[PDB]
Amino acid sequence: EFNILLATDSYKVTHYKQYPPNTSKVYSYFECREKKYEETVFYGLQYILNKYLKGKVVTKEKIQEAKDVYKEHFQDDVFNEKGWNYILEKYDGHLPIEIKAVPEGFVIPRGNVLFTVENTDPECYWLTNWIETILVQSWYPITVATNSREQKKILAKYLLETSGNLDGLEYKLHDFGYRGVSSQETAGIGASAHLVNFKGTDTVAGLALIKKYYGTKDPVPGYSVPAAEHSTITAWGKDHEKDAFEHIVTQFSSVPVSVVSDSYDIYNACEKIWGEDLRHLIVSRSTQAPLIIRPDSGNPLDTVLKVLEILGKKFPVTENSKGYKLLPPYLRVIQGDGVDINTLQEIVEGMKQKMWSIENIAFGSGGGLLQKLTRDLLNCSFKCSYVVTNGLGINVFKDPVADPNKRSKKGRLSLHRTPAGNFVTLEEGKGDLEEYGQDLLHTVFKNGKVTKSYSFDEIRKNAQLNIELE
Amino acid sequence: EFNILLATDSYKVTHYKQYPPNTSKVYSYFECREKKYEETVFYGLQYILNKYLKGKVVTKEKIQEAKDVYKEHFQDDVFNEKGWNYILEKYDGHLPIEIKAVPEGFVIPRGNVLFTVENTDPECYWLTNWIETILVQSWYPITVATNSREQKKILAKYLLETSGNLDGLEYKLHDFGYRGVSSQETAGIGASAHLVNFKGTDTVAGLALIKKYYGTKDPVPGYSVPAAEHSTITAWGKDHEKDAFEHIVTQFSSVPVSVVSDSYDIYNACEKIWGEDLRHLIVSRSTQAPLIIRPDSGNPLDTVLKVLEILGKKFPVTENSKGYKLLPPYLRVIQGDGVDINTLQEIVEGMKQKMWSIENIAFGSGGGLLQKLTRDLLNCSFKCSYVVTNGLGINVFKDPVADPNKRSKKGRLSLHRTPAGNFVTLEEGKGDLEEYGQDLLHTVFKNGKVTKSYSFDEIRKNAQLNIELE
Ligand SMILES: CC(C)(C)OC(=O)N1CCC2(CC1)C[C@@H]2CNC(=O)N1Cc2ccncc2C1
Ligand SMILES: CC(C)(C)OC(=O)N1CCC2(CC1)C[C@@H]2CNC(=O)N1Cc2ccncc2C1
């Protein structure tokens, strides 16, 4: 059993004794604080609301367990038993909290309010920041979705330049990250975030998360194809790599198949094994079932270029209408080693310079896609901006002398469209003046109930690229 | 409800069709591959074995669900229903797998076998690498434990040099990482890995994980103390920072209390508020209840040094027997911003150069400790080294021409003590020659049962620093 009373930073257990006396309201907000990643995809809050925050989340037993744990953990009795019992007795253990959020999938520039949190009962002023820790973990799906989207921009730019269109863009960056993340839960969350932008994944955990918490009209939100790993090649023995390749492409003769080719010598594999010995098994394949050759080692750019050079001399290459070289439709390449947002850019630019179409290549990314990301990439942060004490509201904030970048916003916040159609966050309750049209934040959680939800289809629509919007 | 049939990389669903015909055995191993991190702490496999791998992990319902999901995911019927049904019918859904591993908490040089996996039924040759994905996630607790231990070495060195002993070392690096990790599950796993080396944590999730899967003689494996956050200071209003400080130290007058002091001006807070206005409330405190001043912004080293210099002029400083400056026992500092293994080193060395004892300071680390780590840091990797096909065992491996660092080991593996008492991994079944004594790996999992396990107390003992043992 998950216990929300045990799902906070230890020090937050002690904060109910630290706020000003006679405080009836604590109001806090989340932003991806300003100073590359100029705009962020808001995604993942709905998962947290449903899995952890909604319904009866307080019980007699959970309160007693927290009491027992904290007694030993602090070697002291500090723990707001009275405060938690109040929620249990008054609200049947539902959290007296209201959360307002920008719609999921929305693409918002840095430094804007993305969601706000406040208590709905004066007794529970302490609860707003109790749940900071769990809500701030939304940094992860936001960051995966954003970084995945930025890679989609790079791919779109180069695919368009080298081919004249964006056909198949949504399968150009595949999630290989299941083994390389920190947990099963992280795998599902991160994979789901990547699927906001693409349709290809091997991180199966993402599928069930989307089905349970978001939903799609299609049976599944992500797809894959058969592929070898080094074990299915090397098991045949060093002298039998050709036998492995032949067996595998024949087993998967009528679907696309990726075959890792660098077990011993990627260049030999391309030029002699695929390019000569087994060439007859390749050139006979359907356009709907290409062989996808997979290098997996060496300098990513150098290796991709050398593989393409080798294949271009063993297979019939055409020149497309943009002037770029194109392998025959039954043959493609996938680079799935060392791919991150930086190396992706390097590879596609290198290909373009050597006159190879991005049509020729797909990418897989594991650690770079799902694990090599932190909360400080987008400066995802939760801060109190407004309190009511003795019936008077005051606008509060931090502003550390040595770091203006950590200054936080003041007062009650709202998010608005500007006259030019951009975004602006209004501070100090100025949204109440109604000079800027409707607040784009919507109540998504109130008093233990999820009040507004988005489908995965809606999220995908909101997160589209401008070029996709033609 | 976790389903092991949906907890693998998609392509592994297709591998049972790719191995050589009549393969009865696939044998694989995990290492932290050689190229500072020269030695790794082996920790976390026991969690995976118990939570995910043991007992009846296959049911009719789980098979049908996987079948239904993969049909859509692959747009084809590639799923091995028969193979999974065999496990259900023959072994009541228990995995016919044997896993041997080095004891948890063991500190082992890079490039050694840490665990091995093989099928115990010839029909389940495909099962060995099915579970690669889930087992490889052990990289995370291994890496957190290892990186946390490397930071303990730094702290030990400087604490010993500046004070003459290691008293309180186990509380010098505190886990602040709960909000900065990618999920609740990751938080618990990561926190538990840090607790292999230290006793201080705010990531409460780590406590219940340890209790459930490992166990300690003590009631809890980790501890904390009351502390403020920016919201409990700023809520008082910008003109009332002093009132906030006074309220908090008075509420927590007889236990240690950390109070964040950089909301507006860290240097003013130290020199004028703590150092003058509230000095009388500080010098009266017990040595068991110090005020711990917490800066949280600016250059970490520069800020710590300036804070110490300020405090040194407002409070009575002594010189310890090693010649280093020491704040009075009722006053300490905690630096919890921007701390990672690199900045930790820079701060303690800078303090040493300015003649400040490491006794004066403790560290908190969040993102650096639990999130800013990837599988490539220690090159944690799972590879097939031995197969049996047509009754003949063959030693198998990869050895990519362009990257000798990715070469894998050959044949049946074992771990041994050398004549000088170091570790060596024997390949090609050479352990059977008995020239190197007994295999140090133990069977930890066999046919659905955990066969050997370790308490958290034993893991801690195994992971001790030499300087602690000495
Ligand atoms: C056919 C079409 C053009 C629509 O799509 C593609 O051509 N793609 C290129 C090939 C593709 C699908 C997209 C990526 C997957 C093949 N999988 C693969 O190579 N894997 C899986 C995996 C998981 C973890 N680690 C290592 C690997 C190696
Ligand atoms: C008294 C003794 C000498 C034994 O130990 C210390 O002096 N310590 C320094 C103070 C200590 C305990 C060890 C760390 C905790 C105070 N907690 C704290 O500042 N937090 C918690 C937190 C969690 C997430 N993010 C930000 C923070 C800010």
Give residue for tokens 């917490």.
B294
Q: What is the DSSP string of A86-129?
A: HHHHHHTT---EEEEEPPTT-EEETTSEEEEEEESSGGGTTHHH
Tokens of B237: 């209003």
Do residues B176 and B365 lie in contact, with contact meaning Cβ atoms separated by under 8 Å? yes
User: Any known ligand binding at A302?
Assistant: no
The position carrying tokens 């206005």 is B277
Q: Whose CA is nearest to atom 13 of ligand 1?
A: A171
Mutate to test the interface with A, among B8, B11, B119 (most CBs of A within 10 A): B11
For residue A375, list chain B residues with Cβ-Cβ distance below 8 A.
Answer: 179-180, 367, 371
φ, ψ of residue A463 to 5 degrees: the values are -90, 5
Contact A17 B262 (CB under 8 A): no
Pick from A317, A312, A316, A310: nearest CA to A271: A310
Cβ of A299 within 8 Å of Cβ of B402? The answer is yes
Residue A216, Cα to own-chain centre: how many angstroms? 17
Do B123 and B95 meet the contact criterion of CB atoms below 8 Å apart? no
CB contact under 8 A, B247 and A12: no
Whole-angstrom Cα distance, residue A470 to residue A463? 14
Contact B8 A178 (CB under 8 A): yes
Phi then psi dihedrals of residue A464, to 5 deg: -55, 150
Q: In angstroms, what separates the C-alpha of A421 from chain B's closest C-alpha? A: 33
Instruction: Give the C-alpha distances (Å, rounded to integers) separating B427 from B406, B432, B437.
Output: 16, 10, 14
Question: A436: burial class by Cβ within 10 Å (0-12, 13-18, 19+)?
Answer: middle
A199 touches ligand 1 (CB under 6 Å): no
Q: Report phi then psi at B356, rounded to 5.
A: -100, 130
Q: How far apart are CA A18 and CA A284, in angstroms?
A: 74
A-chain CB neighbours of B9 within 8 Å are 176, 178-179, 202-204
Residue type, A118: E
Query: What is d(CA B147, CA B371) in angstroms, rounded to the nearest whole number?
Result: 11
> Which residue from B271, B266, B336 is spatially nearest to A399, judged by alpha carbons?
B266
Q: What angle do CA A55, A56, A60 make, to 5 degrees?
A: 170
Q: Flag if A132 and B179 touch (Cβ within 8 Å).
A: yes
- Are the C-beta atoms of A303 and A310 separated by less than 8 Å? no
Under an 8 A CB cutoff, do A226 and B78 touch?
Answer: yes
Q: Comparing C-alpha atoms, which of A23, A49, A55, A52 is closest to residue A121?
A: A23
* B298 neighbourhood in chain A, CB within 8 Å: 400, 402-403
Residues of chain A in contact with residue B299, where contact means CB-CB under 8 angstroms, are: 402
Q: Any idea which ligand is nearest the CA of B363?
A: 2
Backbone angles phi, psi at B148, to 5 degrees: -60, -45
> How much distance in Å is there from the Cα of A336 to the middle of ligand 2?
42
| Relative orientation angle of helices B184-194 and A184-194, to the nearest 10 degrees | 140
Q: How far apart are CA A198 and CA A221, in angstroms?
A: 9
List all residues 6 or more positions away from A94 whose beta carbon is below 8 Å from its beta carbon.
A55, A56, A57, A58, A87, A447, A448, A449
Q: Which residue of B has its CA nearest to A5?
A: B204
Say which of B176, B228, B384 has its CB closest to residue A231: B384
Tell me the backbone φ, ψ of residue B118, rounded to 5 degrees: -150, 155
User: How far is residue A337 from each of residues A304, A347, A362, measured CA to CA in Å?
Assistant: 11, 12, 12
Provide the token pair at A116: 């706000």
- The helices-and-strands tally (H runs, E runs) of chain A is 16, 18
Handedness of CA B27, B30, B34, B35 (dihedral sign): positive
- Give residue for tokens 């925050």: A53
Q: State whether B224 and A299 contact (CB < 8 Å).
A: no
Q: Which two tokens stand for residue B450?
A: 């955990």
* Cα–Cα distance for residue pair B212/B202, rounded to 1 Å: 19
Cβ proximity of A447 and A91 under 8 Å: yes
User: For residue B384, what is the enclosing H or E element?
Assistant: strand B380-389
Which residue positions of B form the known binding site for beta-nicotinamide D-ribonucleotide?
A: 202, 294-296, 336-337, 367, 375
Query: β-strands B291-294, B257-260: how paired?
Result: parallel
Give the angle subtended at the CA of A409 by the CAs of A406 and A413, to the nearest 5°.
Answer: 150
A336 is in an annotated binding site: yes
Rounded Cα gap, residues B102 and B106, in angstroms: 7
Q: Tell me the C-alpha distance between A263 and B389, whole Å.
A: 19
Query: At B459, is the secondary structure helix, strand, or coil?
Result: helix
Spatial contact of B102 and B94, defined as CB atoms under 8 Å apart:
no
How many residues are given for chain B?
Answer: 470
Long-range CB pairs of A460-463, under 8 A, 24+ apart, other chains included? A460/A105, A460/A196, A461/A105, A462/A103, A462/A104, A462/A105, A462/A106, A462/A107, A463/A41, A463/A43, A463/A105, A463/A106, A463/A107, A463/A145, A463/A149, A463/A196, A463/A197
Contact A307, A332 (CB under 8 A): no
Give residue ranges with CB within 6 A of ligand 2: A 9, 11; B 168, 171, 174, 176, 200, 202, 224-225, 227, 256, 258, 290, 292, 294, 332, 334, 336, 362, 364
What type of residue sits at position A261?
Answer: S
Please provide residue B127's backbone torsions phi and psi, each rounded to the nearest 5 degrees: -75, -30
Q: Are A341 and A390 in contact (CB under 8 A)?
A: no
Residue type present at position B196: V
DSSP letter for each residue of B5-34 = GGSSBGGGGGGGGTSPTTEEEEEEEEEE--
DSSP state of B378: T
Determine, for residues A15 and B372 on separate chains, whether the beta-carbon distance falls below 8 Å: no
CA–CA separation, B420 vs B436, rounded Å? 12
C-alpha dist (Å) from residue B255 to A63, A76, A77, B177: 23, 9, 11, 23
Q: Which residue do the tokens 């592929």 mark?
A: A227
Domain ranges of chain A: 1-136+375-453, 137-374+454-470
Selection from B398, B392, B423, B428 nearest residue B410 by Cα: B428
**CA gap A357, A318 in Å, rounded:** 10
**Cβ count near B55 (within 10 Å):** 13
Residues 6+ apart with CB under 8 A from B342: none
Single-letter amino acid code for the residue at B406: K
The resolution in Å comes to 1.6
Chain B residues with beta carbon closer than 8 angstroms to that of A19? 231-232, 235
* Cβ–Cβ under 8 Å, residues A218 and A458: no
Per-residue DSSP letters for B256-308? -EEEE--SS-HHHIIIIIIIIITHHHHTTS-TTS-EEEE--SS-HHHHHHHHH
Rounded CA gap, A361 and A337, in Å?
A: 13
Instruction: Tell me the HSE value of B361 on the side-chain side, using a 13 A CA sphere.
Output: 31
DSSP category for residue B197: T
User: Under 8 Å CB-to-CB from B434, ≥6 apart: which residues?
Assistant: none
In this structure, which topology does domain A137-374+454-470 adopt according to CATH? TIM Barrel (3.20.20)
- Chain-centroid distance, C-alpha A360: 26
Closest Cα to atom 20 of ligand 1: A227
Backbone torsions φ then ψ of B303, nearest 5 degrees? -70, -45
- Enumerate the β-bridge partners of residue A257: A291
Residues of A with Cβ-Cβ distance to B228 under 8 angstroms: 11, 15, 18
Cβ atoms of A192 and A209 closer than 8 Å? yes
Contacts of residue A222, defined as CB under 8 A and 6 or more positions apart, other chains included, come to A175, A191, A195, A198, A199, A200, A201, A206, A207, B73
Phi-psi region of A339 (alpha: psi -120 to 50; beta: other; left: phi over 0): beta
Q: Which of A29, A74, A135, A183 is best to mutate for the B interface (most B CBs within 10 A)?
A: A183
Backbone angles phi, psi at A394, to 5 degrees: -130, 140
Looking at residue A466, the DSSP 8-state letter turns out to be T
Helix (H) or strand (E) holding A191, with range, is: helix A184-194
Rounded CA separation A186/A184 (Å): 5
Please provide the size of chain A in residues: 470
What number of other Cβ atoms are within 10 A of residue A365's Cβ? 27
Q: Whose CA is nearest to atom 27 of ligand 2?
A: B176
DSSP codes of every residue in A253-310: SSS-EEEE--SS-HHHIIIIIIIIITHHHHTTS-TTS-EEEE--SS-HHHHHHHHHHH
**Mutation to test the B interface, candidates A14, A202, A397, most B Cβ within 10 Å:** A14
Gaps in chain A (C to N over 2.5 angstroms) fall after 35
User: Helix, strand or coil for residue B41?
Assistant: strand
- Contacts for B5 with CB less than 8 Å, ≥ 6 apart: B58, B62, B63, B65, B66, B84
For residues A195 and A201, the answer to whether their CB atoms sit within 8 Å is yes
**Closest of A384, A447, A450, A452 to residue A58, by C-alpha:** A447
Question: Cβ distance B359 to B323 under 8 Å?
Answer: no
To the nearest whole angstrom, how far is the Cα of A42 from the nearest Cα of chain B? 15
Torsion sign, CA atoms A175, A176, A180, A182: positive
Q: In what order do the strands lie in the sheet with A361-365?
A: A173-175, A361-365, A331-335, A291-294, A257-260
The tokens 């939304």 sit on which residue?
A: A138
Q: Of the candidates B204, B263, B267, which has its C-beta nearest A6's C-beta? A: B204
B138 to chain A: nearest residue by CA? A182
Residue A156 C-alpha from the chain's centroid: 19
Cα–Cα distance measured from residue A179 to residue A176, given in angstroms and rounded to the nearest whole number: 8
Burial class (CB in 10 A: 0-12, 13-18, 19+), B254: exposed
**Range B220-243 burial, b when 16+ CB lie within 10 A, else e:** bbbbbbbbbbbbbbbbbbbebbee
Residues A199/A228, Cβ–Cβ less than 8 Å: no
- Tokens 């190229």 map to which residue? B35
- B218 three-state secondary structure: coil
Count Cα atoms within 13 angstroms, Cβ side, for A215: 4
Reading phi first (left if > 0) and then psi (alpha if -120 to 50, else beta), residue B448 is in left
Could you tell me which residues come within 8 angstroms of residue B290 by beta carbon, excluding any fewer than 6 positions away? Answer: B256, B329, B330, B331, B332
